[PDB]
Design a protein around this ligand. Structure first.
Ligand SMILES: Nc1ncnc2c1ncn2[C@@H]1O[C@H](COP(=O)(O)OP(=O)(O)NP(=O)(O)O)[C@@H](O)[C@H]1O
Ligand SMILES: Nc1ncnc2c1ncn2[C@@H]1O[C@H](COP(=O)(O)OP(=O)(O)NP(=O)(O)O)[C@@H](O)[C@H]1O
Ligand SMILES: [Mg+2]
Ligand SMILES: [Mg+2]
Lengths: 645, 650
DNA sequence: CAGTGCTCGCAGGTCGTACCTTTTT
DNA sequence: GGTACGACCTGCGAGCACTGCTTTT
């Protein structure tokens, strides 16, 4: 043990990793060693001040940094597994899974997925006066999710500034959110946002529970605090409130989540909320060559009313930062394609390189261009593996197995394994659930009996589901799924129309393969199948080698690569058609995004643009990004083969 | 040298049974020993004249007479096994199964039922000028079957006397028969009447075949010759023509089949057709008590223009013949029910008794009144066991398995084990067979390929694939287990199992079909029997196989009864409108006289007691109607004794 | 370009109609 | 009375037309 702070950390990084008690703010620029300090402190609390691992909580946004830090502390300090380290939402689960029965969340409270929460909205919209038969359900969800991100009730939504939200009348939307709650609450179901707001509701209402939890978080670490919303803050303040051992780390230049409700004021107001906090500032960049740093510092400079802090380079100015405008986007794909294999020959490993884009659609062209040259590719945050119809419906059987209520799942799974269950019979069964205010699954069992709703076809279904329930009380997750896949008939469907479907059944076996890992894994000892549906539904962009890493500019936050390709630096993408109509605040949100990208590169940064670009079936002229003007003369533009132009 | 004639037969019976070569007619009244002569000649040909059994043929109308003459043979004479004994239609089968190719019947031609005849008709009658729904199919079937009973061709039908037939224009009906032939023919298929006409057609065109068959029929016997139709006669004359050893037996008073197309002239004109024949006449009734005979003799007496022949009773006048008019038809069922039990305790066994009725609907009432009292009931000629959907649909798989072109069977099967097979796709499949002149089966295999009958393209390939599996299982497999295969693999058991509460008694019948298919191949005459051989045997069955699928009262029609006898016989529904029937009355005297022969046959079945009944009211299919005594009881009045529900005169 | 919705045409089940009653291979 | 056949809904599937690319636990 005995990790001298001064050995692996510079003097102020050391003094901050030495902070023991009280509120602390660690505020510094990109690649200044913020996270690394956060990892060394965790080791320094245990080894020096003798804090027990079980007293420590460290929370970030994406689960990629969460695992990073777990192991990261380990080869210094054992007990990475004794530490509580995850996202706010993962914590939200664990807390509400242990304490849910206090607030009216019973056994079988579900995790209603994003796509899942649409069928709910569609089913409320008919009842509501605010209309467009044209208003997209996902617009209503935008309102709701963001509202719980601000920690507002439907009543607080009646009183919001704007008389119209998105496309809607203030009171209409509020009412949707008011009938959304009643429906989902009556299904014993909670959504993403609830995992935060409901926890905040748990600590305010039952103070004795908070007290017991704060024993597990005595010493509280938060990375990426610049991206925390009002809810997350409120949860944080409540967890700190007893011992006030809260130490948050962040950068304001890096706050890219505003669209989802990120509050830049949370990191910038930290000492107004905690006057007694200590403030540590890091001025040095350890990550990048001075060549890509000067480029970053000159870009972010253009942002106005930002805290101006020193970021001084510690590395010699490296290989010049380059940009290439290729006539086509396909030639942009081939430029990156080509220049990956070149850099490879020179000795760069595939994994040390990564491709960053504004929006996901940009990845399709990139892939095939890699595929062509046969460059191993690893895409992060594409169309999910758990998004695919194959896997999704199986879990809908899995959810409905544990939760007789879910009618959002019943919709997807009643149809595909064709039981010939009627369309008009689905409406009367919804009129059965409408008249009885009832758990829908039992009405189908009672279809032959009672009010008699094609009669028996329902009794045979409740029997197939009871068979899943009895197989849900006892049987193993890996083989319980198989039971479902088989006995539902989904596997007989897929076999019967199987030529394209055979690759679909291949996915379905892989679900058993991933469920083997989950079960035979170390943290899952005696893990329930309900615990698996939990862990699947919260996954960020390991469950979701030596390959080029494709992904979005947003996802990248917190990582670093020796070589980084930023593609689609163009007016309309970087700063986006949305962010252009926003006005200065919009452009300045983007400028931070482009900043985060630039600060990812360690040795080389290669950025590209296209003269023409296609989006869904029309080719359009493309203009260089306004941001390249901001950095002009800090980079050398390049021809498809690599020389200045 | 064994079977001494003068011991078991009276002298003229003996002289007749002694006839060896040349045409011979034995013509006598009821219960005279005509059939009883027929063995003793057959036995006398073998033991005395040294005729070889394989040279002998004996023919009748009903398998019941095929049983009679087989038992009569075996239980009375050694070496009875090779004797060729069956009906005309059964003969037609065996002859056409052996020689068919000479006349253009391919290997494995299919034998259609009478029900079967209607998918063919319903297919053709849309194209012909005489329009349907006014004219239902079963009328057109009536013409064709009767046309071929006369041995006539569509052209001959254009030349019939009547300008209208049943409800139809002469040439319209003729045209339907002309397009029914071309259809049936193109399926490699033939109906019953063909089993005669085609055989007659086979002997006329190819002489060398007739010659080879006439070796097996050198000596020919025909019982019940009075009921033979024009075709049957023509088939007989041809089989006789070479050696002319034909001996026919019969009674004119007994000719009840005119509606069938029976020729009363055939037995009457025998010596005009065979001027060298011998004519033996039996004047004695061995069967019945003098009391049941006098009643018969005095009834038939009323018929006019019939040959007058003395039937003199040999048995003392027995228990008086009784008649009872019960208020209801139910009380008539109850009177029969009641009096059966009575006759039982006094020592009569159930089987010695039988109940005869005119039309089959009369049996339902009777049954339950037997069931009530719990009297064992053996019903002959009711709704067939092989008529039932369960059975019939399985054999439609069997037929179609052997014969790809059977679109009459395909209809009754393709949809039953629901395959998603198109209603509207059946019309496209029929427009495929209409456009291609093809058998239907290969259009289903060619579904995914070719013209692609879609919205279910795969559905048809999976069908023809289920049928090839039935073809290969038809290739080499046991009849018993081959049907099981069909029952399972078609999914017909699956349907009845799934909705199985009522369908369990149905899947029980399907067990019985495997049971009789098991009982059949175990049978002695079936050695190395093909399943094609079974379907042949099944579709020709008269009113053993039908009755099986003991010691019981026998229920059956007056018609079927022809040729049998019982010590006790009930005759029910002797009433104006049943005996002689509402049709027979409208026919006028010829009709009246037919029915009088029909009633005559009933009376002459009874050995010891005949008991006849009537109802004052009779329900048929809803409304209860006033019922009247039959005008025939008038004919026999003072001859019998009326009775009350308990047995004494009113 | 693609994923989703939404409407046409076709399978099968259930429910109300007409005719039945001659008789058999 | 019984059956056998012809007209009425529900049910599912495969070519339209359509419509959306921000960014995420
Ligand atoms: N005292 C040090 N000596 C050498 N390297 C260091 C030191 N401190 C930090 N680093 C390195 O600096 C790099 C980035 O550190 P990091 O913790 O990721 O900063 P960060 O602020 O969390 N990055 P970001 O979240 O994007 O702003 C890592 O490669 C560290 O190894
Ligand atoms: N010579 C006889 N000796 C003893 N019994 C006889 C003699 N002749 C006839 N019988 C019996 O009387 C029955 C009637 O004769 P049978 O020929 O069988 O009926 P049938 O003459 O054909 N009447 P039917 O069948 O209505 O035309 C026979 O079956 C014998 O039982
Ligand atoms: Mg960091
Ligand atoms: Mg006889």
């Amino acid at each position: 043990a005995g990790p001298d702070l001064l050995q692996a950390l510079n003097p102020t990084q050391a003094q901050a990793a030495d902070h023991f008690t009280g509120p602390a703010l660690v505020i510094a620029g990109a690649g200044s060693g913020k996270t690394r300090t956060l990892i060394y402190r965790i080791a320094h609390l245990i080894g020096h001040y003798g804090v027990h691992p079980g007293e420590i909580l460290a929370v970030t946004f994406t689960n990629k940094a969460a695992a990073e830090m777990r192991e990261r502390a380990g080869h210094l300090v054992p007990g990475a597994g004794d530490l509580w380290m995850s996202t706010f939402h993962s914590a939200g689960v664990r807390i509400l899974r242990t304490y849910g029965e206090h607030i009216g969340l019973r056994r079988g409270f579900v995790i209603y997925d994003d796509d899942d929460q649409l069928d709910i909205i569609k089913e409320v919209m008919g009842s509501i006066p605010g209309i467009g038969a044209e208003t997209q359900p996902r617009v209503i969800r935008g309102i709701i999710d963001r509202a719980k991100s601000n920690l507002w009730t439907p009543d607080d939504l009646d009183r919001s500034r704007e008389p119209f939200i998105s496309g809607l009348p203030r009171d209409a939307a509020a009412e949707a959110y008011r009938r959304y709650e009643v429906r989902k609450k009556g299904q014993n179901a909670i959504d993403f946002g609830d995992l935060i707001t409901e926890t905040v509701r748990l600590f305010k209402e039952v103070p004795g529970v908070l007290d017991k939890v704060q024993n597990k978080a005595k010493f509280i670490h938060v990375d990426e605090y610049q991206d925390t919303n009002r809810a997350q803050y409120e949860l944080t303040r409540l967890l700190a409130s007893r011992d006030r051992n809260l130490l948050v780390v962040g950068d304001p230049d890096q706050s890219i989540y505003k669209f989802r409700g990120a509050d830049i004021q949370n990191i910038l107001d930290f000492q107004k909320d905690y006057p007694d906090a200590k403030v540590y500032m890091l001025e040095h960049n350890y990550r990048s060559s001075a060549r890509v740093l000067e480029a970053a510092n000159k870009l972010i400079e253009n942002n106005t009313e930002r805290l101006d802090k020193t970021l001084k380079p510690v590395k010699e100015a490296g290989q010049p930062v380059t940009f290439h405008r290729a006539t086509d986007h396909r030639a942009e794909g081939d430029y990156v394609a080509d220049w990956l294999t070149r850099l490879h020959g020179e000795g760069r490993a595939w994994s040390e390189m990564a491709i960053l884009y504004r929006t996901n659609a940009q990845s399709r062209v990139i892939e095939e261009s890699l595929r062509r040259v046969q460059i191993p590719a690893r895409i992060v945050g594409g169309v999910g593996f758990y998004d695919r119809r194959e896997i999704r419906d199986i879990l809908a059987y899995a959810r409905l197995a544990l939760n007789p209520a879910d009618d959002v799942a019943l919709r997807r799974i009643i149809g595909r394994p064709r039981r010939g269950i009627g369309d008009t019979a689905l409406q009367k069964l919804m009129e059965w659930a409408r008249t009885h205010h009832t758990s829908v699954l039992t009405a189908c069992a009672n279809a032959a009996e009672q009010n008699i709703l094609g009669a028996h076809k329902a009794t045979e279904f409740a029997g197939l589901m009871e068979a899943m329930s009895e197989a849900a009380d006892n049987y193993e997750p890996a083989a319980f799924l198989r039971f479902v896949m088989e006995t539902s008939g989904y596997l007989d469907l897929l076999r019967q129309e199987g030529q394209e479907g055979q690759v679909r059944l291949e996915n379905l076996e892989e679900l058993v393969s991933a469920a083997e890992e989950w079960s035979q894994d170390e943290a899952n000892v005696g893990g329930s199948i309900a615990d698996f549906l939990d862990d699947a539904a919260l996954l960020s962009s390991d469950m979701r080698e030596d390959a080029v890493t494709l992904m979005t500019l947003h996802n990248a936050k917190g990582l670093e690569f020796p070589v980084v390709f930023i593609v689609g630096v163009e007016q309309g993408l970087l700063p986006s058609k949305g962010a252009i109509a926003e006005g200065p605040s919009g452009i300045e949100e983007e400028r931070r995004l482009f900043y985060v990208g630039i600060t990812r590169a360690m040795e080389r940064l290669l950025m590209t643009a296209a003269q023409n670009r296609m989006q869904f079936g029309k080719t359009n002229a493309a203009e260089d990004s306004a941001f390249l003007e901001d950095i002009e003369g800090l980079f050398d533009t390049v021809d498809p083969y690599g020389q200045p132009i």
